[PDB]
Amino acid sequence: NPNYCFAGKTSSISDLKEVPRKNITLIRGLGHGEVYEGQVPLQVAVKTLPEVCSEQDELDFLMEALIISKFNHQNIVRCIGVSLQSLPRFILLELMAGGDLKSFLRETRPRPSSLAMLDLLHVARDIACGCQYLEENHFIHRDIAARNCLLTCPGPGRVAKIGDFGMARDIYRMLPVKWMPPEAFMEGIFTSKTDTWSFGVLLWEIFSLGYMPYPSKSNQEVLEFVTSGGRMDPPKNCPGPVYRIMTQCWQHQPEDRPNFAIILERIEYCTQDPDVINTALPIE
Numbered sequence: 001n002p003n004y005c006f007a008g009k010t011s012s013i014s015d016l017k018e019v020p021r022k023n024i025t026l027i028r029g030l031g032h033g034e035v036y037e038g039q040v041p042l043q044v045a046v047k048t049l050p051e052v053c054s055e056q057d058e059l060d061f062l063m064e065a066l067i068i069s070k071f072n073h074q075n076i077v078r079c080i081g082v083s084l085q086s087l088p089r090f091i092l093l094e095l096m097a098g099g100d101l102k103s104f105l106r107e108t109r110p111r112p113s114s115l116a117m118l119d120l121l122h123v124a125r126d127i128a129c130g131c132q133y134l135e136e137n138h139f140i141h142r143d144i145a146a147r148n149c150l151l152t153c154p155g156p157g158r159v160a161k162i163g164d165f166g167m168a169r170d171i172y173r174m175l176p177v178k179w180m181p182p183e184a185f186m187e188g189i190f191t192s193k194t195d196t197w198s199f200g201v202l203l204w205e206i207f208s209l210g211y212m213p214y215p216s217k218s219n220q221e222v223l224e225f226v227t228s229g230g231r232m233d234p235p236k237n238c239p240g241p242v243y244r245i246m247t248q249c250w251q252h253q254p255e256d257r258p259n260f261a262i263i264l265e266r267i268e269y270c271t272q273d274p275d276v277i278n279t280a281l282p283i284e
């Protein structure tokens with residue numbers, strides 16, 4: 001059984017909370033291996049490992065379990081436990097009834113039939129807080145993007161959390177190029193400033209209300225665009241103060257990009273600014 005180290009502490013499969021299979025009930029699919037809504041009553045999202053898999057897939061699954069179980073922060077999805085001693089094997093996560101952030105943005109965007117700038121700034125703050133936690137614990141996420149974030153509920157009290165760690169698990173042992181800084185896809189150098197760049201792209205995703213980054217551009221086109229200094233324009237109706245956070249996250253030199261403490265400070269300032277939060281989002 002392979003070990004996992006986070007924050008200088010070492011854990012193993014034995015440290016995972018094994019939940020008796022008989023105590024676990026599947027309710028319905030949530031999409032995808034496959035993920036189900038379940039009960040243990042505690043509501044859970046149940047990630048499954050296909051029984052037809054390689055020994056490598058099984059190690060990947062175990063490592064994902066260790067990674068999430070060892071985090072402790074309000075903006076990172078909780079792991080209730082695992083069921084690894086029955087097949088198919090389960091990882092049990094906090095059920096985020098709001099679903100993934102990218103689909104939420106698409107589905108909840110203002111129309112003649114609702115969201116405000118403050119809703120978006122709150123999502124941004126939430127994820128930035130999670131990223132700050134990762135940064136201060138020297139963990140590089142490597143794939144900070146709307147598709148990897150979840151919401152506790154559809155309504156105003158929603159809290160956003162980072163909910164997937166598959167890329168980080170792979171690296172611990174298909175590239176998200178549109179979310180990566182120049183030194184990452186060029187030299188394969190990763191640091192906390194890698195996540196800062198990605199957060200800038202997530203910020204664009206959020207204030208565009210769920211558009212794919214670099215509209216009309218392919219991966220290689222983005223690679224060449226970003227490498228030569230190209231940056232995305234502001235999303236429709238995006239306040240200048242918010243766009244300026246994005247452009248700071250996308251500084252070419254990693255040292256010129258803000259850490260997440262500074263990012264959080266800037267998001268907070270935007271939230272206070274009436275001219276920012278009084279700005280209406282577009283209605284499609």
Ligand SMILES: C[C@@H](Oc1cc(-c2cccc(S(C)(=O)=O)c2)cnc1N)c1cc(F)ccc1N1NC=CN1
Binds near residue numbers: 037094100147163164
């Ligand atoms: C592993 C999975 O975890 C979850 C999904 C949903 C969740 C996702 C979508 C919709 C709903 S719903 C129908 O209950 O509103 C709940 C709610 N809680 C989770 N803990 C997940 C984590 C992410 F960070 C991003 C996407 C997903 N998936 N995987 C398969 C589907 N989403």
